[PDB]
Structure formats: structure tokens, C-alpha cells
Paper text:
Regulation of the frmRAB operon upon formaldehyde accumulation is mediated by the first gene product, FrmR, a DNA-binding transcriptional regulator. FrmR is a member of the RcnR/CsoR family (DUF156) of (predominantly) metal-sensing transcriptional repressors. Upon binding of an allosteric effector (e.g. metal ion), affinity for DNA is weakened, alleviating repression from the target operator-promoter. We present the first in vitro evidence that formaldehyde is a direct allosteric effector of Salmonella FrmR.
However, generation of a variant FrmR, responsive to cobalt and Zn(II) in addition to formaldehyde in vivo, is achieved by single amino acid substitution at the putative metal-binding site (Glu64 → His). To identify the sensory site(s) of FrmRE64H for metal and formaldehyde, diffraction quality crystals were generated, and an x-ray crystal structure was determined to 2.19 Å resolution. FrmRE64H exists as a homotetrameric assembly composed of a dimer of dimers as observed for the structurally characterized metal-sensing regulator CsoR. FrmRE64H has a kink (∼45º) in helix α3, not observed in (any) CsoR structure, which is enabled by Gly83, a residue specific to Salmonella FrmR (distinct from Ile83 in E. coli FrmR). This region (as suggested for metal sensor CsoR) is anticipated to enable binding of FrmRE64H to the frmRA operator-promoter, although the precise nature of the protein-DNA interactions for any DUF156 member are unknown. The pyrrolidine side chain of proline residue 2 (α1) is in close proximity (3.0–3.2 Å in the four independent locations within the tetrameric structure) to Cys35 from α2′. A second FrmR-specific proline (Pro5) acts to terminate helix α1 and positions the amino terminus of FrmRE64H adjacent to Cys35.
Residue numbers in the entry:
A (entry chain B), B (entry chain C): 2 to 90
C (entry chain D), D (entry chain A): 2 to 89
The structure:
Amino acid sequence: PHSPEDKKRILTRVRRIRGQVEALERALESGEPCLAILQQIAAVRGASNGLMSEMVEIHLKDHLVSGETTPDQRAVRMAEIGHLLRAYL
Amino acid sequence: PHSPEDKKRILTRVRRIRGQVEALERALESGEPCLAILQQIAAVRGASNGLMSEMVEIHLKDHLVSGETTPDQRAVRMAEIGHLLRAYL
Amino acid sequence: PHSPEDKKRILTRVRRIRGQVEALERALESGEPCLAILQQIAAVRGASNGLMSEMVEIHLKDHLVSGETTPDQRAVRMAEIGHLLRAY
Amino acid sequence: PHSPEDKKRILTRVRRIRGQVEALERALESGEPCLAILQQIAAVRGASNGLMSEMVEIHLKDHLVSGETTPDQRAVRMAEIGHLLRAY
């Protein structure tokens, strides 16, 4: 995220997830039911996906859309993400 | 896909999928075992995913990287597919 | 799918997919815009997933839930399906 | 997870996720480049997915396969998980 507001809202998502992952680690140590564990992991998966989507859009918008850039510059930028994107599906 | 070669290899992938979807429809009519159908379905999901990844990459290369475009042009192009990408994950 | 009710609803999904894929093949043959093509491929991927889901739930219910089975019988049936679930 | 080995290996996955998320939280606080962050976020998505996968397989084996259960018991257990599978 380039702009402060983007940085801000991504950090907010990450701290939420950290909290979920901490709650999940507690439940494993404390021997909480298998069902609950499965549910918590599903919540973490959903939130990680959601974070990935927002972050992909921010990155593309910041590096491929904005700025009086050249196609050569944007090609390098696209290549850096290409591996990430293939994996995303 | 803009270039003829890109159009060609996507059409090639789609025809492959058509073949699978045709075979699967056959297996359903023919009362073939459930496991096989589940498998054939899994292969179609797999090829559909792979087709998506590749097309996303081609589209991003053709509309966001290539061409002496303005940031305004790229924003319209990015918005046209923003929804697809969110949906893609 | 075992039951007629589950068998109709799966075929209906496939024929729907068939149609989308033929339309997609048509748009590629006719040289239509990238955007249109991207959008249909995305609709086909989505329909592929929905179908995978409906079919997984059917298979689990038919082979793991229904029937007075032994854990051994269910272990075999589960194993043939497990790798698929991992990929999904 | 029921067995100690399935319990250890899931905890090990969660702790590694914990680590990645704290590392990610760190890069954001410190103002590191966009690309690094996208990459770390992508590794966490990947790890979340793998964990979901492993846990689904563990849950299905422990509650649908193992144990002299009735189809009625398995139906209740299956329904509790069905939604999760669809979204997955």
C-alpha cells in the first residue's frame, strides 16, 4: 500500500487476523472442541483471502494504473507479481 | 487475447474443456459410477481455474502493461475487471 | 449422484456449463473483445466451482452418511475422495 | 483434531502462521515496500488454505469415518461441516 490510508486499512486487517490466529492457538493449547477449531481456521482462511484481494487491487492500482509510467516499467512491475497471481488461482 | 497467438492458445484450452464437459454429460446420461463423475468434475474445475489464471495474465499484459497509455485509460481498464478480480478470490 | 433428484440437478448444471463454454468458443472464433472473453471465462470458472461443491456434498452424503456402513467401508470411500478435497 | 499427532501438526501450522502474520504486521509498521507486503500476504493466504485443507481431512476422518456411528449421527456431524466445505 503506497498512500497512508491504504497502509492504515491493511494494517487494520492484519491485526484482526493476528487476533484470530492467537485465539485459534489458545483453543488448540486449551483443548477446545474440534468443531470450534475447524470453524476458526475457516474464518482465518476467509480473512486471508479477503486480505489478498484487497492487496492485489491496491498493488495493481498503485503500480500499473497510477503514474506517468512507461510500458517497460509496467512490464517489470507485472513480472514481479506474475508468479504471485498464477498461484492465486 | 489481443494477438493471434494468444487467441489461438486460449481457444485451444476452451476446446479441451468442451471435450471434458461433453464427456461428463455423457457419463451422467450413461449412469456411470458416481466417483468417476466426481473426478471428471474435479478435472473441469482444475482446467477452468488454469484457464482463468492464464487469461487474467494475458488481459493484464495487453491492457495494463502494453501500449503508450495514460493513467486515466488504465483506470477505466482496471475498473472493468476489478470486479472479476475480487470475485476471483 | 445416486438419487434421481440429485441426478437431474447435476446434469442441469453441466448443460448450463456446456452452453457457457460453447458461447465462449464462439466469441473466440468470432474474434470478440478481450474483456468479454475474460468475463465468460470467469463465469465458467465460477460455475465450475459451484458444481464441484454440489457434487462433493452429494458424494459425502451418499457414501459417508447414508447406509449402515462400517468404519472400514467409510475409510476406503473417504480415501478415494480425499486428495480431491485437498485441491478444492 | 483428536489424536496427539494430528494435534501437534496443526498447532505447528498455526504457530508458523502466527510467525508470518507477525512478520507481516512488522513490515507494515516499518513502512516496507508494497511488493514485499503483497508477497507476505500471499504466503499467509497460501498457508491459511493448506491449514484449512489439513483440518478438513482430519475432521472428516475423525467424525465421519472413525467410530461405530449411525447414519443419523453422521448426518448431524456432516451438516455442521457442509457450509464450510461449500465456501472452501
